[PDB]
Write a protein that binds this ligand. Sequence first.
Ligand SMILES: Nc1ccn([C@H]2C[C@H](O)[C@@H](COP(=O)(O)OP(=O)(O)OP(=O)(O)O)O2)c(=O)n1
Ligand SMILES: [Ca+2]
Ligand SMILES: [Ca+2]
Lengths: 347, 347, 942
Amino acid sequence: EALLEICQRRHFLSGSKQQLSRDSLLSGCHPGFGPLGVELRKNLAAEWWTSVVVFREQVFPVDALHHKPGPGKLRENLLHGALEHYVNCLDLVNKRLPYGLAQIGVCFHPVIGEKTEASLVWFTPPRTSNQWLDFWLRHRLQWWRKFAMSPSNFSSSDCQDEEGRKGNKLYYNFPWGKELIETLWNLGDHELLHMYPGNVSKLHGRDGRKNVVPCVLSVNGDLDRGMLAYLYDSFRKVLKLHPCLAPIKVALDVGPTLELRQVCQGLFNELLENGISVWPGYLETMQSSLEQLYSKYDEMSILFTVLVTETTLENGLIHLRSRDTTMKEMMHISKLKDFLIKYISSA
Amino acid sequence: EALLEICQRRHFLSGSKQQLSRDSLLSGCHPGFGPLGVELRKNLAAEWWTSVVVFREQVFPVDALHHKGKLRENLLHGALEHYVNCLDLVNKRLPYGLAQIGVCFHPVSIGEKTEASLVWFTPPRTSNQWLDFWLRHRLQWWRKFAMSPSNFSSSDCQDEEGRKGNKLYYNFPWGKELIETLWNLGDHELLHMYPGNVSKLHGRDGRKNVVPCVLSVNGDLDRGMLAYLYDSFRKVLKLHPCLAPIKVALDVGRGPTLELRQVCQGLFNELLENGISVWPGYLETMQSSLEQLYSKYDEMSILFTVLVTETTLENGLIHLRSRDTTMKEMMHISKLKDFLIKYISSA
Amino acid sequence: GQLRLNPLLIQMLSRGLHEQIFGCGGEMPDEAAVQRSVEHLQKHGLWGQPATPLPDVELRLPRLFGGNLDQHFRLLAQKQSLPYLEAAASLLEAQLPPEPKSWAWAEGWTRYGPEGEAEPVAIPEERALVFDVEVCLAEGTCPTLAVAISPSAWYSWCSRRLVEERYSWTSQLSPADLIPLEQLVVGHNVSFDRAHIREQYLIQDSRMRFLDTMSMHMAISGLSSFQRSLWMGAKSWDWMDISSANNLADVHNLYVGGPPLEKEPRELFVKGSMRDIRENFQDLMQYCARDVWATFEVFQQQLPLFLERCPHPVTLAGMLEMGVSYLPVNQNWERYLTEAQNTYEELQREMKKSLMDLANDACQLLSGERYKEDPWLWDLEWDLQEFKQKDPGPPSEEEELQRSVTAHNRLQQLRSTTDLLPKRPQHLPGHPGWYRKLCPRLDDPAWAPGPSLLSLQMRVTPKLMALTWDGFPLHYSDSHGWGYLVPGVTCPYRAIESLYRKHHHGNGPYNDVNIPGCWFFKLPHKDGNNYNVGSPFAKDFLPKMEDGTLQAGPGGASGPRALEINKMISFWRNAHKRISSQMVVWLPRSALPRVVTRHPSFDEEGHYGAILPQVVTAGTITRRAVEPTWLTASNARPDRVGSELKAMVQAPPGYVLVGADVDSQELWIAAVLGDAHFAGMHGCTAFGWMTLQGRKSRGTDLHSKTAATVGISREHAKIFNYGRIYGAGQSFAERLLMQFNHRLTRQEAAEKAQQMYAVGGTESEMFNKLESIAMSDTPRTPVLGCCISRALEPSVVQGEFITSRVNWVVQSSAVDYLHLMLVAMKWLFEEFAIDGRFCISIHDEVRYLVREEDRYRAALALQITNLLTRCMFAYKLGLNDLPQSVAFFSAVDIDQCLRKEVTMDCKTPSNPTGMERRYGIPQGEALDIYQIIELTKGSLEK
DNA sequence: GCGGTCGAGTCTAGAGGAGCT
DNA sequence: GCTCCTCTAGACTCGACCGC
Ligand SMILES: Nc1ccn([C@H]2C[C@H](O)[C@@H](COP(=O)(O)OP(=O)(O)OP(=O)(O)O)O2)c(=O)n1
Ligand SMILES: [Ca+2]
Ligand SMILES: [Ca+2]
């Protein structure tokens, strides 16, 4: 209700109000995500990629095209594509199990609509299939709860497939009800055996000293629906997005106008060099009350609101307001970068 | 010619070696990139971002859906729809720009190509000036990473409508191939998509209002990867550190294996947590010849190689080799991360 | 006609069975007794109410040895305890050779014959053994060394982890490292020494039983909790000379006297590493041998004394059997521990994050000075410190660079202003006063964003969560501890007044605090009004916050989600150390029987272990077993982390766990004592009549009637009635009613307690029987004749500690009931070849690990043993009959795991899916007597 | 020369046990 | 009819250096 107005004015997702219906967003066909929503999705992708691929010695990226020829229709699931590269990526891991792939892309779900997909097609020996599945569920639920303000809304459900294969589905308790945002299915050897006929000696992995056919496992996660879940969870109008997820970190406004403009430009260059994305606030031509400007910033979920006042030419002290706190501090302009990187690097 | 063997064998591209067709590579209908190629494309896209949208004040990210039963011709039409929407992101102050990294469709019938399209809603007076500005900046950016920036070339071409256009090129060994193009399309597309209703078509450029003449700058990141790969190519792929997918490789010498593995794991975690991509070469039980190991690391464009041996248990000194100078040196553990960061930043 | 009826119309035992137990003929009922019982019943209005007779039962009970039931038991107990009392007598008299001056260093057992000569052996090869085993607690749980004595020589055992210095040994245990060994093993607190024996953990029972000198001591001269506390504080007072604490030194002083026992001052086995124990071997071994000899002397002075205070052999034959408790687990135990610990950590992190969010969202009240209106955060510090000090066209190629360097140098010159900054940086001077303390200093290497130093125990957390007691905001004062304000920087009494309207008598309207517009009632501490609570998050307040009295006040999500997290993790916090440290020995598949290894439910990749509880077979003056981990009142609550541990005790494949719960055994024991004392027939006491003819479904039993009378929950009324039976006075009931209902005052609680205890009453002839058997010169149990503790006999402690003895009567009667059940079950198992063994005796429950093919026969045997036990109680009390209703089990459970019901899915935050979804445990069968007879054809034998 | 933190030190309140390690 | 020990965490205090 009220959230979609905030998510529209602050350009999280654009389009006319008639287009922003829950059915449109959930189905996968919607007009598009605005720049701040794009940056939130980028931050979510970065955090997922870190926690999944970066701090792992056996996880590799993969590339699946948006099209699927043969039996001509666009793609609907990324897992069906990641399985094709399995035999190719075994050379990198010298056939050492367990190992898996990863990819973040756009998959089109017929309703035509598309969803930003995240995949963790993960291969384990059959001996530890149940243990690896349980560990990955315990890890992915923790990952989803990590950035969330209300972990209890995120949940886990155990399910069995038509063949009785053990699997788990994650949900976010949206205001209207639970919605699937991740599915961990122990597909077994069915998909790989079907895709790769003939001798199955090509698929063998070095489970210790035993060569055994891998037991796949897909952790498909919808990043568009996950981003919408975080935008509903975050929600005085504020969006308490996790400091590692907020799209814009600092709103470098400006308080002699030319000298302050030069200082703001220097600081803007300084912060951007260290990865702290900035929102230029020294380009407006409309004076506004600080309360109104702040309430404009809070909807954007800006971690800090730097203000390079006139006095900074004398002693170099700049105002700094934090979203969550609501209290402002006067920190020396030389120590700004270290404090910001320390605050957003704890994770 | 032999470069394509390196890319596939070192997991830059994907697919069988017999289907490495140049036209498929240059037309977007290739089976897809490998893991290292995916990371190289991500590095390019990140550098393009830092150079076009990060260090600018009026450039913002947008995205448009692939479909519209046929997909989008170009990324431009989404920006033309955001024209009404994004005319509030910059507070209606013409000029303003939009940039995007997204898949364009080229029937070679379906094909996938990701374009770094940049649009600039400049006023009619300064359209030529900003066209020259973007041309110079794009040529600078494409020549910055190049080992031989003379191969990159530009040209001036006239279209049927009398709108000047600039076409960039790379001097591939077989010949000259387009990698970017610029057009001063004008206001025809925006007026056609929005007939009448001049209130939306005009923005505050100066004190007056005006309808901007769009400028299209479109460079193929997928083909820029090929251009830079051919720029690099004993067997060696020298690359700028901002683009190389994986930068440092860890190894283990003689026994004892347990403590060497522990110190290598600690070093790997230390390097990763600081944002340096590391190839976990210490997990392999069998260490091959140092010459072939270093050749393999060189073929992955790995900047430095680390060989942690039993001497590190005695005094801590390790072996550090740079691909550019192929000269080894000794360094303690606590200095390796600082040296890697300094080498990455200084280039 | 199988139907029978006593003159009180209670359906007695079926004629087909009564003749097989109490014999034919019987005795005619006395007219005077019948008239008195009828008048007593119709006095309470219970006379005339009809109950539909239960379907009569016919069975062929096995032949009863001896002339009657009492002689039958005695014969059973004698034939069970003879081969172990023979070894006990062989060990009581012995000419033990002198202790070896120097002990050997080889592995395994070594034999020290005459004059200290060392000889290596593999097994002690002796029936009797006084046994003590020492463990290096720092290294792990494997036994380090053990010293044992037999009537022929001395023995010692040194493990591989002490003899041989090698790399780290496997953390997971196995029978391959434990102590190799009819037999009898005597020790002090032998349960500890029991768990380190290799052959104990094998599923098939090795015929060896353990005698604990501490169990004998607690049976002979034990002390109650009050008496133990008085004895410890000091050291009508003669019982100190005859009783002592459970410490081996104190017991040795009491039963032997003389030089004090040698106690190690360094404590290498508890604290020192393996090297210290290796180096001090010749001293630790002598200490262990001295402890062994002390235990031997206490055993010599106890065993002849013990058998003269428990003359009936059933008591000893059961005590030998209650010491072989066996809890089989499987690979689900390790996963249970992991999942529980991980969930506990995640819930703690979520609670910490919610507290941090509450702190962050509270700083906003500083703006506009609205914090003066918040009922909770007004008292904090909110002052701030000052930061004291000591279009244009495109730019050409050169213009961009010159502008950038101009901006850079304009910024760079500001670095020179570092002089004005103080050398020691300030710590967040723009944030309020209370918020600065919670934030770690920027200089600190362990800095964490936000108020990282916030925790439950602080004086500000009960303020951020806006905790409300009965809707009243909490409040803390230094001189009075934590309390709450009742409405009616200046404290915003107006906001507190408004808050309570949306949502009085207490622990005292303290006016020495003077919070304006309010009265500061303290929180009711568990130690009385004289003490003051330091934390409203204490374990004593969990029922209060689960009752809805202690809420998080104004809804803000974080508030409650925290409080509920604290309620959810209220169990695992207290028991994670104990449950995670349980000794599990994973039996290798080479030691598993063919029944398990050849069953469809067997898993080739699973591990089946056996947790042997360190139960004290006589853990109190009342002789009931004591074990805090297992033998406690607990169940898999829907909102409790890690409460499904009992559901994790899963029988191995091919085996099932045929157990049953006795229905109100303590109540019915009280009822049978009362009716035996009053008129000599069942139901002659109104309490007995309501215990027999009462219906839980219809709400006629004592619990439901009391709950209706005093208007409290049935769970409160259960504890109330069990306390009332245990002899608790009126003041105890007043305290219980005050704790259960805060609104009730002292006068109302006193009046209600007195009225409830005024009910000659419905139970007077039961209390008179209990007192007349506790004020006698030698209080003995009315069934087996077990004697009371020497620290309680009226000769020694006249006039005091009566309540302990009146409770002891009922509790030791229940223990006698349990011993009779165990003896009868063992006899049935041995005679009819029912392949099974004892598993656990949690409270009144009795579980047996029976083979799968004999689950129904085991159920029939359990029903028969219950019938025989109740008949034996009636026989000893002098009734020679038994009502049909209590003549059998209501339902005998046959399930794969320990569980209060065979229908519970055990949904806990640890395993939200349930038992069947993940562990694969299906539901069990609850069989009444008729289904058991239909399935078994009525005959135990195959 | 004088105020502003900073580190022992004690007090209080709660929590584990009343064995044997 | 109701306390002993040890062990841990939170809170207030005084004495002491040091930067202004
Ligand atoms: N204040 C109390 C209440 C109970 N118990 C003991 C006596 C019981 O035998 C045992 C088990 O209690 P349950 O309530 O679980 O078993 P019941 O059969 O008595 O419950 P109910 O009568 O409601 O069916 O706990 C106790 O020691 N002190
Ligand atoms: Ca012992
Ligand atoms: Ca019961």
